[PDB]
Design a protein around this ligand. Structure first.
Ligand SMILES: [Zn+2]
Ligand SMILES: [Zn+2]
Length: 221
C-alpha cells in the first residue's frame, strides 16, 4: 500500500496494479509541503509524472522505485515549470531519463535557469509505454501559464497537478504566476474532455475525484 523512506521523506502509495502515487515533502523555512506525482509500472520500464522539489529528492525517488519494481525509470512527464515539478531536471538529464514537456514549459524552464525538458508535448499528446497508455492535455492557463494534466485512459485516472486543489486546500496557494480569470475555463475544458473520471490526483494533498475540480472552481470565486 504505502512504501516509505526516511529523512526528507519519500512515500509511494498504490492506486492500482501498475499505478502508484509518489509524494515527497519539500520544505524551505516556513511553508513546508508534500507534492504528488505518479509512478507508472510499464513492461518497458518505469514512467514518472513529475520529478520532485530538487535533485536530492529526485535521485532518492528514482532509486526507490528502480529497486522496488526492478526496472529503470525511462521517461518523466513535467506538468509545469515550477520547482516542485522540474527541480530534478538535472538528475533526469544526466541519467539519460527522457523529460517530456510542452514547448512552453521548456521555454519557461530555460527562462528561469533550469535545464530544458524536451518540449515535445502538443495540446493533446498520446504516448504509450509498454502497454501503458498515457495522454497529456494542455487545457489552458490556470495555476501557471503552461500547466498540463495527464490522463490514464485505461483507468480513467487524471493527474491534475497544481491546476487542481485538494479538499484540504482552502485557498489558491501561490498565484504569482497564475491566471485566475482563465483558470475556471481551463478546469471546464478538463471536465468537458474527460466526462467519466475514476480518481483525480492533485499536485499537493490527498487523492480525490471529480469533486476536486469542482472544489477548485469554488476557490476561484
Ligand atoms: Zn506551481
Ligand atoms: Zn505545486
Amino acid at each position: 500500500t504505502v512504501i516509505k523512506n526516511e529523512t526528507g521523506t519519500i512515500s509511494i502509495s498504490q492506486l492500482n496494479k501498475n499505478v502508484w502515487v509518489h509524494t515527497e515533502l519539500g520544505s524551505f523555512n516556513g511553508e513546508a509541503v508534500p507534492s504528488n506525482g505518479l509512478v507508472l509500472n510499464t513492461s518497458k520500464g518505469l514512467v514518472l509524472v513529475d520529478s520532485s522539489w530538487d535533485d536530492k529528492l529526485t535521485k532518492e525517488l528514482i532509486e526507490m522505485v528502480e529497486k522496488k519494481f526492478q526496472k529503470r525509470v525511462t521517461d518523466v512527464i513535467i506538468t509545469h515549470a515550477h520547482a516542485d515539478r522540474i527541480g530534478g531536471i538535472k538528475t533526469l538529464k544526466e541519467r539519460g531519463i527522457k523529460a517530456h514537456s510542452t514547448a512552453l514549459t521548456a521555454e519557461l524552464a530555460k527562462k528561469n535557469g533550469y535545464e530544458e525538458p524536451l518540449g515535445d508535448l502538443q495540446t493533446v499528446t498520446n504516448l504509450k509505454f509498454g502497454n501503458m497508455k498515457v495522454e497529456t492535455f494542455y487545457p489552458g492557463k490556470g495555476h501557471t501559464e503552461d500547466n498540463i494534466v495527464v490522463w490514464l485512459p485505461q483507468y480513467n485516472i487524471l493527474v491534475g497537478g497544481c491546476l487542481v486543489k485538494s479538499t484540504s486546500a482552502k485557498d489558491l496557494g501561490n498565484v504569482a504566476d497564475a491566471y485566475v480569470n482563465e483558470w475556471s475555463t481551463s478546469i471546464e475544458n478538463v471536465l468537458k474532455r474527460y466526462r467519466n473520471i475514476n480518481a483525480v490526483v492533485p499536485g499537493h494533498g490527498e487523492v480525490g475525484d471529480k469533486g476536486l475540480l469542482l472544489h477548485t472552481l469554488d476557490l476561484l470565486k
